[PDB]
Amino acid sequence: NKMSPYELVQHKEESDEIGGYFIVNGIEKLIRMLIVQRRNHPMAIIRPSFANRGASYS
């Protein structure tokens, strides 16, 4: 977490090893960032599927 690059090369990793990924079965994995709706904001929406949901639905 806080090792300087000298200690990082001493512990066999890399000079400027970066984080953000996991190791599972010796294969490195990353949880890819995804884009989602802005939180805590009511946004007006027009969508045909809203009317397709039922009857009398605008």
Partner 1 sequence: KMQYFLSTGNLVSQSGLDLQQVSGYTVVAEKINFYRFISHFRMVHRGSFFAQLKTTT
> Pick from 23, 21, 41, 24: which is nearest to 33 by CA?
21
DSSP, res 11: T
Judged by CB under 7 A, how many residues of this single chain contact DNA?
Answer: 7
44 binds partner 1 (CB under 8 A): no
33 binds partner 1 (CB under 8 A): yes
Alpha-carbon span 17 to 26, nearest angstrom: 17
Binding mask 3-22 for DNA (x = CB under 7 A): --------------------
Structure tokens, 9: 């090369």
> Given the rule CB under 7 A, which residues bind DNA?
24-25, 27, 47, 49, 53, 55
